[PDB]
Amino acid sequence: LYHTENAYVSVVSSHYSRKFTPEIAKRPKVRDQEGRINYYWTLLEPGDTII
Amino acid sequence: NGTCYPGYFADYEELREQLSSVSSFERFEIFPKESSWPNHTVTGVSASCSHNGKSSFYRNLLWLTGKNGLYPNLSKSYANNKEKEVLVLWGVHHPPNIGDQRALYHTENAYVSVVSSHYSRKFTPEIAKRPKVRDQEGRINYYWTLLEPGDTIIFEANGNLIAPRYAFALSRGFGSGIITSNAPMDECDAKCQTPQGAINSSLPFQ
Amino acid sequence: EFNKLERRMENLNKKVDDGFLDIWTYNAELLVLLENERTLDFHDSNVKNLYE
Numbered sequence: 001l002y003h004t005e006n007a008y009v010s011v012v013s014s015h016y017s018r019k020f021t022p023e024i025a026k027r028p029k030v031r032d033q034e035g036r037i038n039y040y041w042t043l044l045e046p047g048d049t050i051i
Numbered sequence: 052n053g054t055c056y057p058g059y060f061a062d063y064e065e066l067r068e069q070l071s072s073v074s075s076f077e078r079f080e081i082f083p084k085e086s087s088w089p090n091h092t093v094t095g096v097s098a099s100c101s102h103n104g105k106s107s108f109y110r111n112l113l114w115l116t117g118k119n120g121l122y123p124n125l126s127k128s129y130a131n132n133k134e135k136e137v138l139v140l141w142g143v144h145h146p147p148n149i150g151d152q153r154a155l156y157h158t159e160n161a162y163v164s165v166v167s168s169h170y171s172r173k174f175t176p177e178i179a180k181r182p183k184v185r186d187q188e189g190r191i192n193y194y195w196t197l198l199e200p201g202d203t204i205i206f207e208a209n210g211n212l213i214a215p216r217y218a219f220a221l222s223r224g225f226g227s228g229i230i231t232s233n234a235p236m237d238e239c240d241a242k243c244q245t246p247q248g249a250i251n252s253s254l255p256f257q
Numbered sequence: 258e259f260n261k262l263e264r265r266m267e268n269l270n271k272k273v274d275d276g277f278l279d280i281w282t283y284n285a286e287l288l289v290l291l292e293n294e295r296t297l298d299f300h301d302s303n304v305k306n307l308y309e
């Protein structure tokens with residue numbers, strides 16, 4: 001899928017900062033899927049920037 | 052005037068709640084500046100913490116840097132022989148690019164380890180480009196802990212450490228707090244204080 | 258039970274407990290005090306009614 005083995009995601013704001021790394025494992029199927037997707041959210045103030 | 056260098060303060064509201072019940076403390080030097088770090092340089096300042104028109108740094112923290120082109124491992128320990136709780140604070144630096152990290156600490160994979168009898172944590176720097184807050188793209192994260200009498204705390208690092216310099220020995224008491232007000236200070240004496248003014252009365256309601 | 262980094266929750270729990278205890282103590286004492294007078298007035302009125 002991504003042609004790499006060590007991947008990173010970085011989300012940075014003026015007062016928000018986080019880094020994410022994937023975890024590869026075998027899990028019980030929930031909706032016929034063994035992979036997962038994690039969801040995140042944030043609130044951005046007027047005049048601010050997110051990267 | 053809060054944190055002149057941008058960053059994140061961990062458990063800030065819990066620290067305020069703890070300080071709301073302290074009546075006095077004693078500020079003592081836990082790691083003296085002139086005799087604790089022979090292998091490192093202890094003169095580091097930033098333009099975002101300027102004082103009297105010149106760049107400076109905090110007063111209870113120390114910025115260590117490599118000397119002679121090397122940053123050897125550091126391991127320091129302190130035992131609480133004060134019959135009181137001790138508040139210890141430190142920090143971790145996150146530079147904006149890998150070139151700055153290599154120029155500052157001469158390593159690419161750095162770790163900080165802080166260990167007590169009932170406290171243990173490990174920190175790793177994160178390098179990224181961020182929007183400038185006070186003309187800075189790097190960050191510093193601040194951490195604190197309370198040390199019980201007779202206990203020991205150990206710091207180990209090979210880079211990116213903002214070392215403690217001063218600590219406080221806390222003394223507790225009842226009937227204190229932190230209030231926000233705009234009123235001026237006068238020379239009176241009263242039994243009740245409010246953010247608007249003092250009350251001299253024995254009535255049951257207000 | 259709370260750990261060392263959960264002092265605000267502990268303080269809120271203590272505040273709730275103390276407030277409820279104060280309110281119920283006040284209610285009980287006031288009720289007893291107020292009924293005690295009405296009982297005696299009731300007895301006096303009964304005696305007066307019998308006499309009349």
Ligand SMILES: *[C@@H]1O[C@H](CO)[C@@H](O[C@@H]2O[C@H](CO)[C@@H](O[C@@H]3O[C@H](CO)[C@@H](O)[C@H](O)[C@@H]3O)[C@H](O)[C@H]2NC(C)=O)[C@H](O)[C@H]1NC(C)=O
Nearest residue numbers: 052053054055056098099100101102103107108184185186
């Ligand atoms: C402590 O708080 C004072 C304010 O109570 C800070 O002074 C203020 O500092 C900012 C940032 O340096 C100044 O803004 C700058 O102004 C210059 C010139 O106008 C402009 O070129 C910059 O782009 C920026 O906007 C601000 O003028 C200044 N205010 C006063 C009254 O001096 C001070 O920096 C704080 N110090 C610490 C260590 O936190």
Ligand SMILES: *[C@@H]1O[C@H](CO)[C@@H](O)[C@H](O)[C@H]1NC(C)=O
Nearest residue numbers: 087088089090091123125126
């Ligand atoms: C570095 O400091 C230590 C003290 O912790 C000292 O023993 C050592 O000799 C110093 N390094 C050199 C090269 O002298």
Ligand SMILES: *[C@@H]1O[C@H](CO)[C@@H](O)[C@H](O)[C@H]1NC(C)=O
Nearest residue numbers: 122123124125162207208209
């Ligand atoms: C410094 O620490 C690293 C990692 O623990 C280690 O590999 C290295 O040998 C240490 N340096 C010395 C001089 O022992």
Ligand SMILES: *[C@@H]1O[C@H](CO)[C@@H](O)[C@H](O)[C@H]1NC(C)=O
Nearest residue numbers: 239240241242249250251252
């Ligand atoms: C409050 O009353 C005390 C009692 O004499 C007095 O000493 C004090 O000055 C009074 N304070 C104010 C603000 O009136």
